[PDB]
Design a protein around this nucleic acid. Sequence first.
RNA 1: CGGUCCGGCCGGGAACUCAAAGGAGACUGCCAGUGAUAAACUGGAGGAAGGUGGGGAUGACGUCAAGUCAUCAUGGCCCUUACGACCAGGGCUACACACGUGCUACAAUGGCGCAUACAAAGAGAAGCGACCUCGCGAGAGCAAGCGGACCUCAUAAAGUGCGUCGUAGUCCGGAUUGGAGUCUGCAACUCGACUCCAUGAAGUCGGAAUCGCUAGUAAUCGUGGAUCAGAAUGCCACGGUG
Lengths: 113, 150, 98, 100, 79
Amino acid sequence: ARIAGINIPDHKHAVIALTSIYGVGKTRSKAILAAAGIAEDVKISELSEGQIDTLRDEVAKFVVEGDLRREISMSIKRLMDLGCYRGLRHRRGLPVRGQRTKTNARTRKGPRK
Amino acid sequence: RRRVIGQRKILPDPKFGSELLAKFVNILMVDGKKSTAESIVYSALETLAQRSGKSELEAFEVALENVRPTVEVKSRRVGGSTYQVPVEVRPVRRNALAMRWIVEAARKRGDKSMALRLANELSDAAENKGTAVKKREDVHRMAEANKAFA
Amino acid sequence: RIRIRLKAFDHRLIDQATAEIVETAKRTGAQVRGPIPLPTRKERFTVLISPHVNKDARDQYEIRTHLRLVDIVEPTEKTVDALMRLDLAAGVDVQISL
Amino acid sequence: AKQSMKAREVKRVALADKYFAKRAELKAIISDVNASDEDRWNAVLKLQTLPRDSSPSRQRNRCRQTGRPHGFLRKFGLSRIKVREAAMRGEIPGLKKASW
Amino acid sequence: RSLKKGPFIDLHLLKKVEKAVESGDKKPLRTWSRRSTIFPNMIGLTIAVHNGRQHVPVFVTDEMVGHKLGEFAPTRTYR
RNA sequence: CGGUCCGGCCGGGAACUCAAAGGAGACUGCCAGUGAUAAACUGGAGGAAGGUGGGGAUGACGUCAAGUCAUCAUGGCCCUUACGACCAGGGCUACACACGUGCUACAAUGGCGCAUACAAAGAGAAGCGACCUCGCGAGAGCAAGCGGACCUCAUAAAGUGCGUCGUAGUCCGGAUUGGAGUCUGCAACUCGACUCCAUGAAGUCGGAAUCGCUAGUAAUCGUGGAUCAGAAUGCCACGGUG
């Protein structure tokens, strides 16, 4: 139950359901299935509760479960005091890539800035 | 102007058979992959034969009998007077015009699968149940009065 | 033991140079393999058609670079000693290999 | 365009001969501590870091009849805007015309 | 990430720093090498940089070490 | 045709192919009609090809009394401790929005997983770099072939075929992101490109209106090369599916 975490899909095999959740995408889905010892062909019923979710350290090769996102806004609360460009661009409402002012901003400030 | 090259005479096919079936597998060709329509030609008929007609032998005859254009409409002017005018269509390609109006709608509608997008279109064509045909007829009906001229 | 190469930019000039090679290297010793034509490395050489304000049209020139190997089988350095001295007119390049 | 380029060429060809064109394979041994026990590279590194003007950057060769930044035919050396009177008159060997 | 070779400055600016740190005494400097990446000893020095019209004074702290003199302030200030 | 795991490989050889060249074929000539039986059309036969053979090269005086001195020259006026020219630092993605031209999607005949095939034309020695390693990977190493019909770049994709999802502002789509890496150069903070693992906005074929066509053309999918310190979906060539 709830193999897809926050999301609803469950009538689906782990290789398309144990994906796009908790800091993992899809790049290692076959490898964790091969740790459990399961074939990628034919549908499964002999997989127990929490079984493949017990092997997640085969795919946790990332800042999973917000290991960085639980700090990023506080790292920015220090960055936004810095007398440098990357700090200035975090304490005045200014872009850092794209958003060329020679084009329309649509609703970012509304008609006539 | 008057020349213009002589319009083409098309072809039949040694497997698909008639000139119209040889047109069906060649019309509305996009991306040029040329293997998609040979699984869709005379393959939407077995369910049509139990939905909007009978047999796989008459399921496509009746579709091009229910979809039957007999008149075209176009503007015509003579100096400071303009009319919408009706003209009778020539019979020799008449069923190929009707064929085109079905196979394009399976592309311009995007609902479920291609194994449905044409079969679902044909089951209304074999009944003359096309989109917005009441307002289409309302133009030809209005233009009928202009066969009496000014 | 050794072999030769001949290069030119014209089909009639490389024949006019082949006529000298067969006469300069292939009569003593007498050598009988005839000249294969080989590819001409056909290409278009292109530049803008006008020097000002046009970039849409290009001027078309035909470039070819002809090759003849002519073939020699006599192993002696004497086979080329006269070819490294005689004409061979202007417009062609000869090369002695191995 | 101006005729300004030779007053740079005369200093920048020598700048390249001394500090670029014969300094490229040097990079594969100048910083290697295992490939030398002799002290030979430290001093020429201090010389190689002396110039700060051009060589691979800030400097383009440009055509000879006019110092235009582009139009130089690499395997011919001529400008494509100062060649037509020679090209048409058959003055470049191997080029043919017309219609193909 | 990036950087990518540690701090680096113009070799005239290295002399201006050397003169100040060895004298025990700092004097006003004006520089066009505004893209120099400051050394950890440049803090507190009396420095100004060219903006494209004039020289403008910049205040160097431990919080600026590893950055360029163009990172200190914005270039566009009308908007 | 003789030998031969049965590969032009070895004796040999141009029927075929490749290479380039030179000849020949087609001319409205022949026929039947049409037409002041004139001058000149239409149709047929035979033909690989039929009617300026098909297609290019072209551009008759003049027109706008057009643009260009900043592609190249140059007159007169004008500038002279300079409006000249030797340099360094800055401007061109400075912003209220419009206008031109393009790129990738909005798919489901598509998306994903897996298996599997064929190139063609080009460039190339402090080069193109095999086989092989090291790094998720950009790349970086070790180290043969070959100065190019030879060897290398190098791998054909679309497709094929079995499972799987199922018209959803998300399942497809990818912009501004979050993190660490690849690189040239004096140096990429700000104005440049590439990669790997999570996240994620718009996008349901488009306003009036108006623009372009015709067989290997439209659309579709692969490759090379020029420019060049470094970087282009741009520019110039090659080929498949049609």
